[PDB]
Design an enzyme around this catalytic site. Structure first.
Site, short mmCIF file in Angstrom:
data_model
loop_
_atom_site.label_atom_id
_atom_site.label_comp_id
_atom_site.label_asym_id
_atom_site.label_seq_id
_atom_site.Cartn_x
_atom_site.Cartn_y
_atom_site.Cartn_z
N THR A 239 -9.22 24.86 58.12
CA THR A 239 -9.87 24.08 59.17
C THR A 239 -9.33 24.47 60.55
OG1 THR A 239 -10.29 22.22 57.69
CG2 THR A 239 -10.37 21.78 60.04
N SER A 282 -14.18 19.49 59.37
CA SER A 282 -13.83 18.89 58.08
C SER A 282 -14.67 17.63 58.00
CB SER A 282 -12.34 18.52 58.01
OG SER A 282 -12.08 17.81 56.80
N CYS A 348 -5.68 12.03 58.68
CA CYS A 348 -4.93 13.28 58.61
C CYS A 348 -3.45 13.17 58.99
CB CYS A 348 -5.58 14.35 59.47
SG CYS A 348 -4.73 15.95 59.39
N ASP A 389 -18.90 23.72 55.56
CA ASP A 389 -18.43 23.11 56.80
C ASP A 389 -18.61 24.14 57.90
OD1 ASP A 389 -15.74 21.19 55.35
OD2 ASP A 389 -17.41 20.39 56.53
C1 HEM Z 1 -7.69 20.68 63.52
C2 HEM Z 1 -7.41 20.82 62.19
C3 HEM Z 1 -7.52 19.64 61.13
C4 HEM Z 1 -8.62 18.81 61.11
C5 HEM Z 1 -9.90 18.61 61.83
C6 HEM Z 1 -8.23 17.94 59.96
C7 HEM Z 1 -9.03 16.83 59.44
C8 HEM Z 1 -8.69 15.99 58.37
C9 HEM Z 1 -9.64 14.88 57.94
C10 HEM Z 1 -10.96 14.52 58.52
C11 HEM Z 1 -8.93 14.33 56.88
C12 HEM Z 1 -9.44 13.12 56.05
C13 HEM Z 1 -8.75 11.82 56.65
C14 HEM Z 1 -9.16 10.58 55.94
O1 HEM Z 1 -9.07 10.52 54.70
O2 HEM Z 1 -9.57 9.63 56.66
C15 HEM Z 1 -7.77 15.03 56.74
C16 HEM Z 1 -6.74 14.74 55.67
C17 HEM Z 1 -5.60 15.40 55.49
N1 HEM Z 1 -5.10 16.53 56.26
FE1 HEM Z 1 -6.05 17.34 57.82
N2 HEM Z 1 -7.00 18.25 59.40
C18 HEM Z 1 -6.60 19.26 60.09
C19 HEM Z 1 -5.39 20.01 59.95
C20 HEM Z 1 -4.42 19.66 58.89
C21 HEM Z 1 -3.19 20.40 58.70
C22 HEM Z 1 -2.79 21.61 59.61
C23 HEM Z 1 -2.50 19.86 57.62
C24 HEM Z 1 -1.24 20.25 57.03
C25 HEM Z 1 -0.11 20.43 57.57
C26 HEM Z 1 -3.45 18.76 57.25
C27 HEM Z 1 -3.17 17.91 56.17
C28 HEM Z 1 -3.91 16.87 55.69
C29 HEM Z 1 -3.53 16.02 54.52
C30 HEM Z 1 -2.35 16.08 53.65
C31 HEM Z 1 -4.56 15.09 54.37
C32 HEM Z 1 -4.77 14.00 53.42
C33 HEM Z 1 -4.05 12.68 54.05
C34 HEM Z 1 -4.17 11.45 53.18
O3 HEM Z 1 -5.14 11.22 52.40
O4 HEM Z 1 -3.29 10.58 53.23
N3 HEM Z 1 -4.62 18.59 57.98
N4 HEM Z 1 -7.57 16.09 57.66
#
Ligand code: HEM
Length: 399
Positions: A239, A282, A348, A389
């Site tokens: 992403t 995403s 996130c 996506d």
């Molecule tokens: C600009 C880049 C990113 C975008 C747009 C993004 C977007 C998201 C979105 C929309 C979710 C779902 C949140 C929800 O359940 O309400 C999410 C979950 C998550 N993201 Fe990202 N993310 C990004 C970068 C990252 C990175 C770099 C990591 C890792 C280091 C990451 C790790 C996670 C994890 C572990 C979850 C699941 C959290 C949970 O359910 O508790 N994300 N992300």
């Protein structure tokens, strides 16, 4: 019931169905790949409700969970990590790795994020574009977030380039099922070894913290550590890549705002805000199954029925964001949070890290290369297939 997910209307645009549903049928049913059904939520307010309602669950073993692909079907069966948990298990495990992603921790990482970005930009400068344009993805978009998350997890510097390539293979549209599955297991095998290593002697990285704080005392086992580490790697790396690419392609289409950014690099933060709203790279992560009958708008979602909340559509909800279909970093923001990173407890875990990486990219890129330009007609930009996506596979640029 139309088949979901929908395909984007065009290269950089959201599926055309969202705008129509937001106007005359905000909550409706769609048909998934196996013929089963699920409810689709499109309005900002309703997306927020789905993300925070305690009556909804992310547990995939539950009846009616909306898996969007055959892979999702099989994937749901294995032992779950916090991404697919409800309280209290959710924060019980998430709290094990969250300390590294807090604002304070991320602010402490700035020098490193900046250094990593500068190093990759310098190698581009030294390589040049004298004979023609180079690929911004391969040379910059891809390695920046990859090198960062791998390093944080604990990967030694020498292995970054190989592992970055292998991880990309997992999601390259060019890859084959066999190849994707292989690179997938390879990374897991590597992480299993890294874990044994930090178990012997911990260093300052995420895997070591898990090994000392959770594995040794027996709170979780080595395999769990491997799984949590793998989740942090794959959750948003692809992403981040697309977001950086879409950011450069977007500025290429908006010369006036691009002039503002070059004139004042400090606008990076506000540029990133509009970007994360405009391009919701995403869009299929906010999914739930109702634990009991719950009402959403003028519809009743039955216990055990699936729900998909589109944060992408929510970020284009005119009732919340004025002139939502126009990229304008100078827009007057409303009190409602844009939903590029989700909402509620599951929001996130790396939102702060992601925005800091993007901000560092856009406050530096044009300072380094003031004449940086996309080398192919914007209309010929190679975006990801319309059924996936939004994103960009490759992006030729000159400077
Ligand atoms: C600009 C880049 C990113 C975008 C747009 C993004 C977007 C998201 C979105 C929309 C979710 C779902 C949140 C929800 O359940 O309400 C999410 C979950 C998550 N993201 Fe990202 N993310 C990004 C970068 C990252 C990175 C770099 C990591 C890792 C280091 C990451 C790790 C996670 C994890 C572990 C979850 C699941 C959290 C949970 O359910 O508790 N994300 N992300």
């Amino acid at each position: 019931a139309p088949s979901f997910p929908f395909s984007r209307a065009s290269g950089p645009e959201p599926p055309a169905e969202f705008a129509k549903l937001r106007a005359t049928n905000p909550v409706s049913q769609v048909k998934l790949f196996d013929g089963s059904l699920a409810w689709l939520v499109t309005k900002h307010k309703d997306v927020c409700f789905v993300a925070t309602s305690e009556k909804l669950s992310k547990v995939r073993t539950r009846q009616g969970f909306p898996e969007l692909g055959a892979g999702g079907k099989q994937a749901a069966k294995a032992k779950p990590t916090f991404v697919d948990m409800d309280p209290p298990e959710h924060m019980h495990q998430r709290s094990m790795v969250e300390p590294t992603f807090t604002p304070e921790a991320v602010k402490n990482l700035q020098p490193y994020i900046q250094r990593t970005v500068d190093d990759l930009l310098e190698q581009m400068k030294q390589k040049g574009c004298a004979n023609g344009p180079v690929d911004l993805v391969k040379e910059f978009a891809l390695p920046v977030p990859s090198y960062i998350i791998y390093t944080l997890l604990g990967v030694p510097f020498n292995d970054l380039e190989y592992l970055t390539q292998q991880n990309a293979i997992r999601t390259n549209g060019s890859s084959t099922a066999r190849e994707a599955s292989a690179a997938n297991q390879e990374l897991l095998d590597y992480l299993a070894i890294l874990v044994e290593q930090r178990l012997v002697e911990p260093k300052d990285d995420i895997i070591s913290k898990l090994c000392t704080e959770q594995v040794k005392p027996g709170n979780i086992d080595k395999s769990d550590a491997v799984q949590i580490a793998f989740l942090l790697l794959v959750a948003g790396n692809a992403t981040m890549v697309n977001m950086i690419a879409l950011g450069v392609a977007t500025l290429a289409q908006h010369p006036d705002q691009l002039a503002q950014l070059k004139a004042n690099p400090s606008l990076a933060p506000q540029f990133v805000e509009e970007l994360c709203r405009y391009h919701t790279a995403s869009a299929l992560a906010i999914k739930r199954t109702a634990k009991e009958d719950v009402m959403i708008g003028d519809k009743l979602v039955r216990a055990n029925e699936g729900i998909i909340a589109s944060n992408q559509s929510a970020n284009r909800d005119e009732e919340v964001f004025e002139n939502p279909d126009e990229f304008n970093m100078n827009r007057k923001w409303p009190p409602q949070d844009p939903l590029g990173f989700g909402f509620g407890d599951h929001r996130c875990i790396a939102e702060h890290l992601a925005k800091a990486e993007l901000t560092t990219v856009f406050s530096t890129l044009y300072q380094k290369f003031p004449d940086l330009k996309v080398a192919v007609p914007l209309g010929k930009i190679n975006y990801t297939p319309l059924n996936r996506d939004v994103g960009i596979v490759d992006l030729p640029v000159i400077f």
